[PDB]
Amino acid sequence: DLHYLSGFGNEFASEALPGALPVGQNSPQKAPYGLYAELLSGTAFTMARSELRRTWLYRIRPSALHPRFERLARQPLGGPLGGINPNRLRWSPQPIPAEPTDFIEGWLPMAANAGAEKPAGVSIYIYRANRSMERVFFNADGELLLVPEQGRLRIATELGVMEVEPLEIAVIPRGMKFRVELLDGQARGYIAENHGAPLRLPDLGPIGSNGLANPRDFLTPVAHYEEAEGPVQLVQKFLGEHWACELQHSPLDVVAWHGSNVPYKYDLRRFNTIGTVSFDHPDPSIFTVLTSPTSVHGMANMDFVIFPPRWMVAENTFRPPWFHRNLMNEFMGLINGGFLPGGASLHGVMSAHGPDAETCEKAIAADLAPHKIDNTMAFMFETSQVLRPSLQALECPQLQADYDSCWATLPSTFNPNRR
Amino acid sequence: DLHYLSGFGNEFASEALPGALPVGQNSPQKAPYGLYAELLSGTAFTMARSELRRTWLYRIRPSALHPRFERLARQPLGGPLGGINPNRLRWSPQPIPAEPTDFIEGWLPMAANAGAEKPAGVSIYIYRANRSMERVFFNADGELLLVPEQGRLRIATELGVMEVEPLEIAVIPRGMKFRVELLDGQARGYIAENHGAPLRLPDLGPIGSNGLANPRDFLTPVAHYEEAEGPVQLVQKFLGEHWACELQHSPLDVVAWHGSNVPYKYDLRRFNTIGTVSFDHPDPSIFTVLTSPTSVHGMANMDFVIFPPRWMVAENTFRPPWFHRNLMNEFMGLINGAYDAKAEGFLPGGASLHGVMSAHGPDAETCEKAIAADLAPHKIDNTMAFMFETSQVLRPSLQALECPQLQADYDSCWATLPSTFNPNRR
Amino acid sequence: LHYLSGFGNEFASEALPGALPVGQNSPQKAPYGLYAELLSGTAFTMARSELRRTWLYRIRPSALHPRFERLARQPLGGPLGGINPNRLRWSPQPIPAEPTDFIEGWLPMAANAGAEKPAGVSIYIYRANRSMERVFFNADGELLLVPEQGRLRIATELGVMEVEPLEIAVIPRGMKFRVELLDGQARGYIAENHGAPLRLPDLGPIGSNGLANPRDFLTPVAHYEEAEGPVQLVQKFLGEHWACELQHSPLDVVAWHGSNVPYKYDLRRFNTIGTVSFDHPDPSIFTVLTSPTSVHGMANMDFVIFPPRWMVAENTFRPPWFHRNLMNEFMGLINGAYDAKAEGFLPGGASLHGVMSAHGPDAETCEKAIAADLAPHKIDNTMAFMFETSQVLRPSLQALECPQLQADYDSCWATLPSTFNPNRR
Amino acid sequence: DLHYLSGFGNEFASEALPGALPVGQNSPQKAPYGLYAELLSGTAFTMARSELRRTWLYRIRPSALHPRFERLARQPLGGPLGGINPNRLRWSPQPIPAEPTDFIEGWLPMAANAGAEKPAGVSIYIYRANRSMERVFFNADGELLLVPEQGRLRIATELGVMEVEPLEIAVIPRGMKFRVELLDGQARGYIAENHGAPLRLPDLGPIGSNGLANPRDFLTPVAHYEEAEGPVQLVQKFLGEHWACELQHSPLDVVAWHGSNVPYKYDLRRFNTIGTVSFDHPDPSIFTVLTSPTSVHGMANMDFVIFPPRWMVAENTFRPPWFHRNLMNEFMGLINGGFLPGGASLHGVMSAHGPDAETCEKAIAADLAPHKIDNTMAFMFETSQVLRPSLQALECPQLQADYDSCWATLPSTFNPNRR
Ligand SMILES: [Fe+3]
Ligand SMILES: [Fe+3]
Ligand SMILES: [Fe+3]
Ligand SMILES: [Fe+3]
């Protein structure tokens, strides 16, 4: 029975004790309950207000109260970049490791725009974990988009507690402290780490003022603070590296807060899917849930896109996705329903992809009538920068060695003598 | 039949005689065939190239060769703006007048953002004609969007001839000369006169790089010139007035041209309609065919929206348009069939106007039907309604306010909406 | 006279040493006991590139004035002319016999809107035969002055500038000034800009230099008057002259700094760009100053010139092409003859080719141009110009009823022949 | 005989068989002639339509029908980065090598904003070839601007065939498959590989609505397809590397196509040159033919600029290019007419350049009259990012070792007692 505040991008305000929030100002000399005011600035001060992300926290002890960070010996993300490889790639789902592995220890580097030491654009991982985190963590390297596939997550953050289950997504702003509890003992899922402009709702164009992901469905947890006394490890990811310090208090000691730099979750089942109600096959940008822009208008750092249960009604139309060569880079995953839940495919810049022969023959031969796609949920992380597969990803047992064969049996159907 | 060039916004090139277009330049000293170069600038010289519209003409006689224009006695567009009236308005179809009336003489002012003498925003007319034009015409007050409802038009312009039937639309650029022949003896339809930024394709947003009105379906006619020798009246519309002069030559004497300021036509049947494949009822802006922007981003001078055959699949959803009050001003027409928010009273050739913040929506009948219905995939078919939606208030003409076609009891359409509210049962 | 240079500069000028406060704008104790006064030419929140504001340090505050009263003599009070799409041409305007100072002799030619609802651009031709014995400001817009006959000595709050034909001058909205005629009488053109202040055009590929170089834009140094006695202060508000009487000189600014300034520019210094190959470039290429709108690329008005220049286009119809324009073209002539008109267009003359009016050369200019052997040719000893506007230019009733309006302008195009032959390329 | 479609940025449509193009839609269930639909997306789907480049293809076999790509042993572009060097540099023309070398094998990297493995901005090459390509190629790393200097090229692309001779340029969109055939036995010329926003026409500013490169002169080939059966090698350039696979069919099998992502050519001899008709010496940006923007307004990724035959008429003026120090980086080449055709010069950020003593002396002394510069075509690739010369370029024999002496005789003509 966790409570949530609704509305993407809102100036929220939540207090765990009556009047814990200062009224009419952010920095009283005598803060209610004797709390410390702290500002979390997720963007430059001078952004246009529409881009502004900042949260005022009123907490038991300042975040400044911490000893020196030291580099952990254990570094899940220190593996090298893979060699150059233009090929189409597909993986089978990643098995959960035997060794104890919490949420942060479990990120397996799949592909990234840059080396972990110079975070830029987007880095993509698959997380595997068999332990709840017995420590607190923040990412200095970017925003985190989590896409669960197996197992629920109870995520306790500075702003409050949220639970996410497969078919839901969650986002945790850069630098925000959080701790992940595995409700089901173990967990698997995907991560897009956003090193760039924070994820937001796409420009709707002609779709207008409603549709796709409705702002009312983005939920942010209410204030919740901890009073545990005794040592707690605080871990941060900085330029790919986990550095840690030990606190003698719980860093999740925020009693009240206000602002717009907030963790949130969204249920993909609430997506107001838009598609063709006539013919043809619309561009997959139409399925956009969240997007991270660049200073180049129209070209996203990354678009998060889903392929949800939907009605198929295209008349006189080849209904599967058409054959395609793309400037952008397509990383596909599957949440449920050769491509299994937990699996992945990377078709990079100008790689030729599309349906196989059996998909083609069946689509061309189909008696086209309205059809409901159901019990499936796929998605794509599409990035503008090339995604370089990690060495780990290219060498792991789960990489399919004959993925190219999927297209081998495509036939010519060309007859010059009959249109 | 007629040949066309495809591609909305293209730099086209067309010549009626081989090599009539100068190669490598626009202004030769000794132009091919002894023709005159002439530049038709549809926009300021300094527009962004994406916003530029200009066409080079290679013609027998320059357009400048004409004597003084004189005001005609006959002025279709000279009637006063009607009184202030915030009411929801509905007209039945406009009958064709008895007296001889060509295409330009036949425009009936329905509503406009401003007085005809001070053109701004959009002016809306319904045309009614029973004569083919035996003169040539250009509108200097703006761009014309034509929406035939009865009868095919054969439109002879400077750049060539195009034919338009109901379910197709045609655009004529401001200042471009043309002549309308009625292929079916008489004709009736709608006009949006755009006084603002030229109509163009909407920004597709998440729809991406394909969909709605695909550019390949926008057709521009090929070069064609007449050589008739004898008097031709040339009329122009200026500040709402018709002014004429007599020429001793045909002003459709353009033997070749190149450029982007072109007349064009579009078959609405080919609209790649996008909608809900899930639930709810998408905003009608999703149906945009063409749009004319203002300097305020996101707020169009006018959107041209259609309501075409389309699959209705939304589950657990009130399917007809929702009840609505709107900053924008909604002028709706019907080209054929029946519209899905309405029941009676709205026929082909009819119109409705719901202005700024007027409360509109479905009737009691429709609401009852939609709430009880067993929802399943359903193809809406054999229908084409549309809307001219404008940001500026539309002021009905006096003629519109006083005509027999104005329906006297339009408000009673919503009279029977019942309360179904039950506070004890969610 | 001395001047400062640099279009758009933050200028600083003092007529007494240390009269400008150093390090601040508003001292409690101003140097020499002067009053600080801010002239805000633009909204406070304009981007800095678009900011126009001047700090004045003056003997008496502009606020020291009694109620303005409406003058009986109203130069600009005439009605709008009727609707008329025709091509129009006017001969030079005679200088009236009645005593007529600078502000009294504005002959309204055409305007985007009625004088009482100013918007866009209003065009006048001024004719004066007396020097101004009063001071004037225009609340309705910025003034672009294009002298054609006789030199002007213009005393402004910021200093004195002298303008002769082939120079232009611009005076910001609200800025007080007095005009002296150095040659007894004067004639010329005005573009009254009700919209965004005139500035230098975006050069595009022309780059970082050329057309009108900013170094050539000149602003007067501070000058102040201490004269004690009655002076009439007139303002133009919503087309009307209103006036009060002061007992001091309002040109009493001892020191000033900032960017809201009067300026002049010598068109002979224009770095004219053109074709060095073929064809005939769009006349936008001759843009001197422009006033934008919120619609990018569509100016409220462009001020363009047609100066001495080299004509070198090979295999090219060199005169301006036949044309039909969305924009509205008001042309005038400072001296000499214009390349597109054989005759009927003289210095002081004017033409108006409104939206989509068909214009171009005549059959005589045509004939010679098509026939001429082409070699490099220096067009010289001429200066014409255009006020091109996006909004329609409505001629005034005066302009349409005045004896200088040529009755048979269309006849200039009547003899254009068909040289068309379907069967030889 | 080759036919072409005209109009830069046009939505084109071309079909080699009557009605090969589906009418009214892009994705029919039963395509005309049994062809496959393939979308080539040259930009993000959500680009403003003015910046959108995409082409629908209707082809015999899908592009996906290919086996695994493998790294070729021969690698033309793998040579390391030259060392740091701020000096002005000038090269004599490049000799055509003895060894058999086709178009893609004969790119000599001259200088680049970045290393081959991390394409950004612009890479500049000189190609030398003595064999026609007997295979097909696409470049995944960027768009190709070709500037022939010696020998004509017949470039067979997916969208059709075009012929380019010196004094013409050709552009090939990223990822588009093509084959270069040498009509003259061998060929040499320059290449600007554009890794950024695609080249387009420059904003004309006051020049207005016509002039410079007029859009009507940009020509795109009509549809042409091959039905040759037998092994064919497909090669791609990815992160600077040549990777290849073998198809058992021609990949130039597009029967029809429509859209805006097209190859094109343009004859520089049609450039409507603009310049001074009064005095002074206009900035060479006035000669821009094509430009690649950045997100920084007014600061191009690259400008392609030409110095063609033209009238010089400036009076009381020093007519040669002024003495000059530039933020931008200037790579000069010469097509026809120390600096020979095929040669190059690099003046990088803030290097001081300008005329030599002989040029100054003659120019200050000349009796200025209209003068037609004729029979000469130079050009420049100006880039915003520093161009690092390749190791190869810095150690090549054609690098002129005494270039700085060109300016060594510049004298002082200063005289303070005579204005
Ligand atoms: Fe794809
Ligand atoms: Fe509505
Ligand atoms: Fe003109
Ligand atoms: Fe330079």
Hey, what domains does chain A have and what are their CATH numbers?
A: 1-84+94-196+213-272+386-407 (no CATH), 85-93+197-212+273-385 (2.60.120.10)
Task: Give me ligand 2 centre to Cα B409, in Å.
Answer: 20
* Contacts B144 to C, Cβ<8 Å: none
Are A307 and A369 spatial neighbours (Cβ–Cβ below 8 Å)? no
D residues 350..379 contacting A (CB < 8 A): none
Sign of the alpha-carbon torsion through B192, B198, B201, B203: negative
**CA angle C253–C254–C260, rounded 5-degree value:** 50
**CA angle A383–A386–A388, rounded 5-degree value:** 115
CB contact under 8 A, A370 and B311: yes
Task: Give me ligand 1 centre to Cα A152, in Å.
Answer: 30
User: Do A and D touch (≥3 CB pairs < 8 Å)?
Assistant: yes
Resolution in A: 2.0
Region of residue B284 (phi > 0: left; psi between -120 and 50: alpha; otherwise: beta):
alpha
Tokens of residue D199, six digits = 């080249």
Q: Under DSSP, is residue C205 helix (H, G, I), strand (E, B) or coil?
A: helix
Of C315, C326, C374, the CB nearest to B174: C326
Are B261 and B42 spatial neighbours (Cβ–Cβ below 8 Å)? yes
Best to test chain B binding among D39, D200, D210 (most B CBs inside 10 Å): D210
Residues, beta carbon < 5 Å, ion ligand 3: C 323, 325, 329
Tokens of residue B129, six digits = 């004609």
For chain B, give the number of residues: 426
Tokens of residue D336, six digits = 């026809």
DSSP-assigned letter for residue C214: G
Flag whether residue A282 sits within 8 Å of chain B, measured between CB atoms: yes
Sign of the alpha-carbon torsion through D30, D32, D34, D35: negative
User: For residue D128, what are the CA distances in angstroms to D106, D150, D331, D395?
Assistant: 5, 9, 18, 18
Of D207, D276, D278, the CB nearest to C282: D207
Are C331 and C75 spatial neighbours (Cβ–Cβ below 8 Å)? no
Experimental method used, please? X-ray
Best to test chain D binding among A203, A313, A412 (most D CBs inside 10 Å): A412
User: Do B and D touch (≥3 CB pairs < 8 Å)?
Assistant: yes
* Strand-pair partners of B160: B157
* Contacts D280 to C, Cβ<8 Å: 209-210, 271
Beta strands (DSSP E) in B98-214 are 107-112, 122-129, 136-139, 143-150, 153-157, 160-164, 168-172, 178-182, 187-194
Out of C2, C65, C241, C280, the active site residue is C280
SS (H, E, C) chain A: CCCEEECCCCCEEEECCCCCCCCCCCCCCCCHHHCEEEEEECCCCCCCCCCCCEEEEEECCCCCCCCCCEECCCCCCCCCECCCCCCCEEECCCCCCCCCCCCCCCEEEEEECCCCCCCCCEEEEEEEECCCCCCEEEECCCEEEEEEEECCEEEEECCEEEEECCCEEEEECCCCCEEEEECCCCEEEEEEEECCCCCECCCCHHHCCCCECCHHHCEEECCCCCCCEEEEEEEEEECCEEEEEEEEECCCCEEEEEECCCCEEEEHHHCECEEECCCCCCCHHHHEEEEECCCCCCCCCEEEEEECCEEECCCCECCCCCEEEECCEEEEEEEECCCCCCCEEEECCCCCECCCHHHHHHHHHCCCCCEEECCCEEEEEEECCCCEEEHHHHHCCCECCCHHHHHCCCCCCCCCCCC
Tokens of residue A349, six digits = 């810049």
Ligand nearest to the CA of A320: 1
Chain A: touching chains (3 or more CB pairs < 8 Å): B, D
Ligand nearest to the CA of C323: 3
Flag whether residue B11 sits within 8 Å of chain D, measured between CB atoms: yes
DSSP-assigned letter for residue C405: B
Spatial CB neighbours of B160, under 8 Å, sequence gap ≥ 6: B2, B14, B220, B221, B222, B223, B224, B263
Are C149 and C165 spatial neighbours (Cβ–Cβ below 8 Å)? yes
Nearest CA-CA distance, residue D123 and chain B, Å: 28
Q: Under DSSP, is residue C48 helix (H, G, I), strand (E, B) or coil?
A: helix
How many residue pairs bridge chain B and chain C with CB atoms within 8 Å of each other? Answer: 151
- Which uninterrupted H or E stretch holds D359? helix D357-365
Spatial CB neighbours of A88, under 8 Å, sequence gap ≥ 6: A345, A346, A347, A351, A353, A403, A404
Flag whether residue A281 sits within 8 Å of chain D, measured between CB atoms: yes
**CA angle A65–A70–A75, rounded 5-degree value:** 125
Flag whether residue D392 sits within 8 Å of chain A, measured between CB atoms: no
The CA distance from B375 to B183, in Å, is 44
User: For residue C298, what are the CA distances in angstroms to B197, B291, B303, C44, C295?
Assistant: 10, 19, 22, 24, 6
> Chain centroid to CA A115: how far?
19
Are D87 and D104 spatial neighbours (Cβ–Cβ below 8 Å)? no
* Strand-pair partners of B288: B305
Nearest CA-CA distance, residue C43 and chain B, Å: 19
A residues 309..348 contacting D (CB < 8 A): 314, 316-319, 322-328, 348
| Residues of B carrying an active site annotation | 281
- Tell me whether residue C194 is one of the annotated catalytic residues: no
Nearest CA-CA distance, residue D77 and chain A, Å: 14
Q: Under DSSP, is residue B215 helix (H, G, I), strand (E, B) or coil?
A: helix
* Strand-pair partners of A149: none
Nearest CA-CA distance, residue B39 and chain D, Å: 11
